[model samples]
Target chain A: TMKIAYLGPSGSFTHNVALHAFPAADLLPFENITEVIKAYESKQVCFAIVPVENSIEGSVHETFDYLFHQAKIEAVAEIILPIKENYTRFWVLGDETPTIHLKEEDQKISLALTLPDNLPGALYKALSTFAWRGIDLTKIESRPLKTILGEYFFIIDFENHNEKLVSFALEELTSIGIHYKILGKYAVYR
Target chain B: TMKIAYLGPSGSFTHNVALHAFPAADLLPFENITEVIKAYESKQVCFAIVPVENSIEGSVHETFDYLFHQAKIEAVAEIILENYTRFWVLGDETPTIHLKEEDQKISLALTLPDNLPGALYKALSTFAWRGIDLTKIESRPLKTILGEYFFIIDFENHNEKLVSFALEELTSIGIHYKILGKYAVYRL
Candidate 1:
């Protein structure tokens, strides 16, 4: 059985990637890249699968620089996984809130954002999607899309996306950016 | 009190810097540069202390790029921190057991590479008096440093004079590098 190393504490996107690539391979999750590299050096794992780049983000510089120094390691293959965004709320059904959507007053929603780097005009375009619909963004962060160092990817979440203005905004952003992957569009109840 | 943010989970060299600069002030540590900026934007902290450049290492590009976007933040003050490296081995006492003294273990012993940029070389030479031998030097893997990264340096165990040598080396690294604080040198 092939041994694979990834960044994980479970439920992490890397874990998802490992499952997708080598479902049956022995999977080992590490706390950080250094530990993963050490494992590889010790001959514990054959190949390490880490994110190298993303469309919305630029690069993972740390991973890149580290790889440069690790003389033995080599890039064997590449995989791209689509990421989705969703708003999650936690509450039990109540009469006052006839439906989950109607119970907006008591719900706290968390959102996720994912984007690629080539979408330079995309940020403006996406922001406009919310602006046109008056949707507010609470959090926006850029994470390393891959461990390649110097590259980054973005993830964002907004309060709501029901307005037609948001739809138009996404359309505009997508139209301008050639490469984009929508992981998922779903609702979470927790 | 000025809130200074640095990359950390404690024990990181940057963390040592935060403590050294603002010994009395509240130190806010983050896992990455983005978090530091977020804290700055939220007004949670007054200022941030990030690694812009190093002697053996190079420029910290993330901080540079981040500054490009975060207009509110400014380079108010800078300091030089000497960087000394000691090999760390989990559950081992003799850090230097694997290699002979002259046969410097590049990976095991902390040192800088020969092809280091001219700027970094001047800095390393500043503390040359202490007889700091940089053997087995490699760059740190973090992209923040650009091509410049960490050099595992080997020196006599943590001593007062060696500490001073480290300080001088830091000073030579350049005006941008800050000497945060030196802690008890760890032995393998």
Candidate 2:
């Protein structure tokens, strides 16, 4: 039996995702996103399921913020679900990247990045890498670098396409001095 | 003689801003931003001063959210005081929009027409193309649905041609917006 962690008060929307995604696994519900991460990172569980976004409420800022700050964790998969008292999306997170065959069409790549500098045209240049390649960015959100004003970290999601093109654009980002992390590349389920 | 609303338990940074700005006008201190807004909205006071943002702590979410949901108030002026105790407020009038050119800032609340690819990029492009210096930009969940948000932005130059053209561009792109106000940076 596998052990999984999730945000919980028990019987919430997150609990359902954990139960459905890891059938027969022991589900441990934590009080909040921070607790869930602590448990997973501390090896209290082999896997964790957390709602990363809601089609209605927007990105779970806590979830995105927590993930952006740590490097040991990675999103292994994504679950897209609809309203049944909820219409939301989730990420299957783990210590190491694992393999799972996913459908080709409608996959997505989620990542976070910081610009090389805060100069004028810096953000435009960072975004242009994807624009020139016709990458359809689903979301672009900026969270405070939290050190001071006028500084930010952008969390971006784009439709996954040919790896070669995507990799090249990412390489361009690095070449231009922007730092980014590929949170995950997973298929979308309806 | 007039009355002003502020967030307080007394002796807080907000209290000082209210006291200093109003200078002997009746100062009414409320517990939080909501109460401050309520007092002003209810006509209990002529103006309210609430911290909109802190250099260290970010945009005051509650203040931004309340302003977006209500239509009666406007950010009449902005006070930029650094570190003595605190920093960040709204008014009942259209506001004359006067402030020190070097310390002036214009705040706005807005929503995009839809959540589509390149939507935000295009919205920001209006400012970028105009070379309008955006001092700060923050978004808070609309809480109505996922993927929708209210963008609260602070930029330099409120009455300049570039700002006007950029605002005009924002309208052309279907961004419904409210000008919080053009405020002067008042240091203690």
Candidate 3:
């Protein structure tokens, strides 16, 4: 029997997914997501099933770390599960959090920014530049920097099916002394 | 002498937070948050400080587990570094999230029997009956057999009545389960 690994004790989402994916295999339960990869790397398990996405709550961060930091793994296949709707499992839900809508101007582009410091209302100010253009912001994450206290780097993802206005928003931010860095622009939607 | 515990061999981020928070106290160092908390729980230390945030990283989650699960510690204060940031939550940020005794994001890790026909789904349905949200799900093997396994699901709310009903549903399905710790979740 092939050895299968997943986040464990018995009743886990990965357990259901594992059972669903490899029902007739030898199952090895691991205490954490890393263990699953470790077992696979060490040759203890033949293959593993992990939570890769739930675009709603973001990705299973731990999985992303192992994939980036160590070990060699691949998405040999995909098993889509239902979320509140996929590997987009609806595990983390924000009830009081603001809901989102897809914008039509430019549907795929994301950029990040770092302020001189995490200034008060810096986020609101930077974002208003986009709002003035009738643009829709999809997601924004504020992560701190290591060298300075309260300095933040913002990862901004926006929907601008077209970029004339998106480019203008960046131009406005730059025009107003807002220093920016482009994380990346997504031309293709996966 | 407030002997505080922190992660160290002397120069960890937590160590700096400790020294900054208790510049005049006796500082004790441990290998991990569990040990730091153990020292406090066992009376070996007056308080413990763990890294709750980093500039590049968002949350130091292991600390959250000890705060949320094993220890009865509350985040009384935070120590900040102009270069990095940390807050004491166990420690609160105005409890960004609040829940009713019935609506909290308390969760559990449990294991059920093998040969269950998607009986796993049958099991999860128990939580759905109470309006609980399935936050995350994972599975691990029982190790003794090739196919025996257990599951861990992060579900929203711990409605006591709903859980009781769930206990009954799981057991009645000819499946057995073990109650793992129900944990804290912060959602904005």
Question: TM-score for every candidate vs. truth?
Answer: 0.30, 0.82, 0.40
Interface RMSD of 2: 3.7
The TM-score leader among the candidates is 2
User: How high a TM-score does candidate 2 get?
Assistant: 0.82
Sort order, DockQ high to low: 2, 3, 1
What i-RMS does every model get?
18.9, 3.7, 15.2
Q: After superposition, how far is residue B23 of candidate 2 from its true place, in Å?
A: 3.7
**Model 1 RMSD in angstroms:** 20.6
lDDT of 1 by residue, A9-71 (tens): 677776776665567678888887666656777778755656543333333434544544343
What number of backbone clashes does candidate 3 have, counting pairs of residues 3 or more apart or in separate chains?
Answer: 40
lDDT of 2 at B184: 61
Q: Candidate 2: which stretches are off by over 4 Å?
A: A54-58, A80-88, A95-106, A118-121, A161-163, B11-13, B54-57, B80-88, B92-102, B142-144
Kindly list the per-residue Cα lDDT of model 2 for residues B78-183, writing each as its tens digit: 6656122224457755333222323667777777876354566666677877777666656666666655577766777755777888888889989877887766
Q: Please give the lDDT score for candidate 3.
A: 0.53
A1-190: candidate 2 lDDT, tens digit per residue: 2788998979888887777667768899999988898888888998888888875555677888789876468787776666762568888888554344444236778888887665324666666788778886777666667665567777788878676788998999899998898888777654
lDDT string for model 3 (B9-108, tens) is: 6887667666655667788988877777777778787666666566655445455445444566555444444113653422322222222112244334
Cα TM-score of candidate 3: 0.40
Q: Candidate 2: what's its TM-score on chain B?
A: 0.85
Backbone Cα, N, C clashes tallied per candidate: 42, 9, 40
